[PDB]
Amino acid sequence: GRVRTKTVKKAARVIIEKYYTRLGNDFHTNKRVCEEIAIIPSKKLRNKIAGYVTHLMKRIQRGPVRGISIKLQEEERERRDNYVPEVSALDQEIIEVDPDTKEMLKLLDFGSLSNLQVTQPT
Amino acid sequence: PIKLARVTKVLGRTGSQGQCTQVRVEFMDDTSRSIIRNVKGPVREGDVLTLLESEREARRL
């Protein structure tokens, strides 16, 4: 059958990683921009690269890939990562606690905690 | 009695040398009687056969 070359793949990844903005879904446009971006000797090789780019973008615009880093999804990812809510999830009104746990707390000087609700195992 | 046939599905290749085709036969007698038969030669899905004996049933199990 037919299988993609390592060289073709790596170059494609480079081209997507750097210049995602220039590329699209039109194969020919992607080919031409590739030709105007990278130092490619062979036509066939260039074509292959373009194809790989095209496939990649068909795939990538649906959802993010495992391999490369996009210059928009880096920002987006960062935004999603450095997120914090308004109210902390540990700052809770009433926390449910075991009798044993309560006992332990008492044996640590913290018998004067207010937020605890000692629920019995029914 | 001579009964005409249909081809519902082409299953695989039987025979020693891979010469016989195992084929699902629907009847053209309106009945949904699906008997699996062996054919010699090229058969595609949508062929119509002329079976000499309809009572026969080819290698099932």
Partner: protein, 325 residues
């Protein structure tokens, strides 16, 4: 009439029943079954894709974390819930539906959680599965808008609001009998039945508890007052030193530990179906075992295979000549 993914999945042809047929565009694209997608490709098109306002989505989630279902829910699940709420607000009066649910009533019994009540075939002292009973087997069956939700986590939030919902059947659903899991360390409930570690404290400590939700909006839980359940039997046992590599099967202790991939070959994990139309021609009555591939010699097994073997306590006695894979 807001359709969930379960409606298409169970092939509920209730396109004749409702007129307000609306769904999310996401839930119909998430289905991986070919027959349901084939059904989507044919059905009389009166359905209309709708996405709700973020004001309503914020309002659903506001009390979804109060009822204790929000972790069990999905993103798409909230979307359907919000769709119903904003559709009810559009046509009918919004004042019908309550904000903030009710305090749950605790009612304990001495029955074991594994008792086969509410299983249709099983019968105590006549309860028969008949060729008439098959379409009747649904749940607990009793005007303009509703839902087609088969998921209980969905149904719970819907009925807490007071949104009149239904199932694959024509008439409205009143009482919702199902099981939920409660962790006996942190007491945080999940409606997701599949999971084995809790979302909160991560231990393998989730235990089955039966719940009922009325159309009124009241919840009650039946806790097991049975010492067999909360018994510290086969729990402390010495564990092997953690091995890495390709073949090492670790004892499985957290929900998110990285296992080395050990899959079964396609020759192996093919089950024989006898109801195939072309089955009779195939030489042998059963699909051949795999014995040639590496997965067989490494003794890679399916998750369902070896189930009760896990339930036995490790500090016990296996037969003198067996090793437990």
């Amino acid at each position: 009439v807001v359709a969930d993914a379960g409606a298409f999945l169970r092939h509920a042809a209730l396109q004749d029943i409702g007129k307000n047929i609306y769904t999310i565009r996401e839930v119909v694209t998430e289905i991986r079954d070919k027959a349901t997608r084939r059904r989507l490709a044919v059905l009389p098109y009166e359905l209309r894709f709708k996405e709700p306002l973020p004001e309503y989505v914020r309002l659903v989630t506001e009390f979804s974390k109060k009822t204790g279902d929000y972790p069990s829910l999905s993103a798409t699940d909230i979307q359907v819930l919000a769709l119903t709420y904003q559709l009810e607000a559009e046509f009918v009066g919004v004042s019908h539906l309550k904000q903030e649910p009710q305090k749950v009533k605790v009612s304990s019994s001495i029955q074991h959680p594994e008792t086969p009540l509410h299983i249709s075939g099983f019968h105590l002292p006549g309860g028969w599965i008949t060729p008439s009973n098959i379409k009747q087997i649904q749940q607990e069956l009793e005007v303009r808008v509703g839902c087609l939700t088969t998921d209980f986590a969905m149904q719970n939030v819907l009925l807490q609001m007071g949104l009149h919902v239904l199932a694959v059947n024509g008439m409205l659903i009143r009482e919702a009998r199902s099981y939920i899991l409660r962790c006996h360390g942190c007491f945080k409930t999940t409606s997701d039945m599949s999971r084995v570690f809790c979302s909160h404290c991560g231990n393998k400590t989730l235990k089955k508890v039966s719940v009922t939700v009325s159309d009124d909006g009241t919840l009650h839980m039946h806790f097991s007052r049975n010492p067999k359940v909360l018994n510290p039997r086969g729990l402390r046992y010495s564990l092997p030193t953690p091995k890495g590599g390709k073949y090492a099967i670790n004892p499985h202790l957290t929900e998110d530990q990285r296992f080395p991939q050990l899959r079964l070959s396609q020759k192996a994990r093919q089950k024989t179906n006898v109801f195939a139309p072309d089955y009779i021609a195939g030489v042998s009555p059963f699909v051949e075992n795999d014995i040639s591939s590496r997965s067989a010699t490494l003794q890679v097994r399916d998750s369902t295979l070896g189930a009760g073997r896990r339930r036995l306590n490790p500090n016990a006695s296996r037969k003198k000549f067996v090793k437990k894979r």
